């Protein structure tokens, strides 16, 4: 019954991306002083099952001046790596016990930009031709802001597995000994996964130009779908790394209860940022990576090399 | 003879501009930060050092067998 476990993980998470689109706007609504989806629910709660069927009735045109084998291959690789990344992730037991899987996250988070380079090219001209070339350019630069300060906690964890990442945090909630790194951990995933303040990707992006600009609601229904699957997955990855919960072997039930409550709270912030701050005007977006983000990340890197040595506090492996 | 303006009852409301509430600034910050961070590393070396002791016990049970 291994095969019944995989389907027990793909299917209960497509609701949690469909029941996030509804909480996308109720939370964003009470900031504007207005109620949620009022009339169809009764409380809203039945909105996405009606808002899903309309997309698969509405005619999925292909553009006449488009290519063929590239345009319908990027949504295959969209949902592939958006759902494959959920595998090696402990809660409290992962589906797969990888020896080194923290690196496998970057082995999965690297290839997502190789679909945007397809879809911007595969269909058509200037509103996604050059306008998607400068969306690959922002997402490549925020790995070296990411991969360094992901390594900067592993000097304190001890190894590459994720079971040690819960063992080392039984008494600490490790956001305290590394709180400068925890800041730039947030803004990276806030800009890499193509969200609201650093937003030259989706729809705020000259407010007209996106990679969604050409997909009718047949193939478009996944792009949005798949994408919303990253944003609840960097949140499930931050809260297993910094803000780690407590594991008890005799009681694994109380792990997940105290766990899903925490990833939901960080997921609120991606909604709660969008209702405050304006955009970044593509220069100043990348003007603060090199000049401003990056030299501090090397500074704390040299700090986290020497401090396990000159404390005589080497982590065991 | 039924016309508007009252004989009295007025404010007015201000034209002003003020909300400068400070705020715990100016060497108060950078002092709670370092004082919190050094509590973190002090909470290290009591766990990371202690886990290395149990680490050697885990290798110990290996070596006492395997002849
Ligand atoms: C459009 C449809 C047509 C395309 C359909 C096919 C698409 C497939 C794309 C999937 C790409 C995922 C590739 C990821 C490779 C990384 C896998 C990996 O590293 O697993 C971790 C593990 C490492 O070993 P370890 O951790 O030490 O095991 C514990 C031992 N105590 O390793 C293991 O546990 C076992 C290692 C051997 C397992 C078999 C080999 C894995 C790769 C098989 C697929 C080959 C890749 C196909 C090409 C990819 C194209 C993107
Ligand atoms: C000797 C002992 C050792 C000493 C250790 C001391 C530790 C010190 C730790 C310092 C390093 C951590 C701080 C990180 C640096 C902050 C990033 C930065 O430099 O931003 C600079 C940016 C540039 O703009 P600026 O210079 O202000 O010029 C324009 C003025 N007209 O100006 C900005 O402010 C930009 C602000 C961020 C831009 C994105 C804002 C979008 C919204 C993000 C909200 C995020 C909220 C928090 C994230 C979640 C936290 C859990």
**Method for structure elucidation:** cryo-EM
Three state DSSP letters for chain A: CCHHHHHHHHHHHHHHHHHHHCHHHHHHHHCCCCCCCCCCCCCCCCHHHHHHHCCCCCCCCCCCCCCCCCCCCHHHHHHHHHHHCCCCCCCCCCCCCCCCCHHHHHHHHCCCHHHHHHHHHHCCCCCCCCCCHHHHHHHHHCCCCCHHHHHHHHHHHCCCCCCHHHHCCCCCCCCCCCHHHHHHHHHHHHHHCCCCCCCCCCCCCCCCCCCCCCCCCCCHHHHHHHHHHHHCCCHHHHCCCCCCCCCCCCCCHHHHHHHHHHHHHHHHHHHHHHCCCCCCCCHHHHHCHHHHHHHHHHHHHHHHHHCCCCCCCCCCC
CB A79 within 8 A of CB A222: yes
| Nearest chain B Cα distance for residue A185, angstroms | 17
Q: Is A171 on the interface with B (CB under 8 A)?
A: yes
Q: Which residue, chain included where needed, has tokens 């072997």? A: A249
Do the chains contact at B37 and A177, CB–CB below 8 Å?
yes
- Other Cβ atoms less than 10 A from the Cβ of B24: the count is 8
Separation of CA A225 and ligand 1 centre (Å): 24
CA-based end-to-end distance of chain A? 34
Do the chains contact at A314 and B40, CB–CB below 8 Å?
no
Q: Is A315 on the interface with B (CB under 8 A)?
A: yes
Q: Is A172 on the interface with B (CB under 8 A)?
A: yes
Alpha carbon A163 to its chain's center: 21
Q: Which helix (H) or strand (E) holds B32?
A: helix B32-43
Cα-Cα-Cα-Cα dihedral of A27, A264, A80, A126, to 10°?
A: 40
Residues 6+ apart with CB under 8 A from A187: A293
Residue A169 Ramachandran class (φ > 0 left, ψ -120 to 50 alpha, else beta): alpha
């Amino acid at each position: 019954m291994f095969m019944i476990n995989i389907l027990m993980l793909i299917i209960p998470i497509l609701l949690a991306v469909a029941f996030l689109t509804l909480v996308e706007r109720k939370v964003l609504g009470y900031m504007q002083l207005r109620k949620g989806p009022n009339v169809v629910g009764p409380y809203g709660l039945l909105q996405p099952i009606a808002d899903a069927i309309k997309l698969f009735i509405k005619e999925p045109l292909r553009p006449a001046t488009s290519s063929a084998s590239m345009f319908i291959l990027a949504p295959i690789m969209a949902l592939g790596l958006a759902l494959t990344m959920w595998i090696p992730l402990p809660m409290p037991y992962p589906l797969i016990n990888m020896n080194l899987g923290v690196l496998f996250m970057l082995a999965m988070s690297s290839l997502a930009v190789y679909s945007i380079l397809w879809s911007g090219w595969a269909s058509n001209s200037k509103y996604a031709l050059i306008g998607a070339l400068r969306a690959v350019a922002q997402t490549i630069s925020y790995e070296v802001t990411l991969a360094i300060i992901l390594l900067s906690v592993l000097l304190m964890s001890g190894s590459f597995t994720l079971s040690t990442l819960i063992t080392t945090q039984e008494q600490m909630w490790l956001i305290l000994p590394a709180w400068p790194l925890a800041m730039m951990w947030f803004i990276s995933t806030l800009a890499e996964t193509n969200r609201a303040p650093f937003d030259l990707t989706e729809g705020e992006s000259e407010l007209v130009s996106g990679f969604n600009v050409e997909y009718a609601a047949g193939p478009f229904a996944l792009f949005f779908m798949a994408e919303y699957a990253n944003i609840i997955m960097m949140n499930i990855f931050t809260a297993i790394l910094f803000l780690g919960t407590s594991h008890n072997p005799h009681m694994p039930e109380l792990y997940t209860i105290n766990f899903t409550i925490k990833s939901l709270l960080l997921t609120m912030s991606f909604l709660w940022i969008r209702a405050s701050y304006p955009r970044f005007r593509y220069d100043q977006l990348m003007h603060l990576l090199w000049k401003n983000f990056l030299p501090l990340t090397l500074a704390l890197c040299m700090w986290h090399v020497s401090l396990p040595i000159l404390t005589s506090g080497i982590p065991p492996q | 003879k039924q016309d508007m303006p009252p004989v009295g009852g007025y404010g007015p409301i201000d034209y002003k501009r003020n909300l400068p509430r400070r705020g715990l600034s100016g060497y108060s910050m950078f002092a709670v930060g370092i004082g919190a961070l050094l509590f973190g590393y002090w909470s290290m070396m009591k766990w990371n050092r202690e886990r290395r002791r149990l680490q050697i016990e885990d290798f110990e049970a290996r070596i006492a067998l395997m002849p």
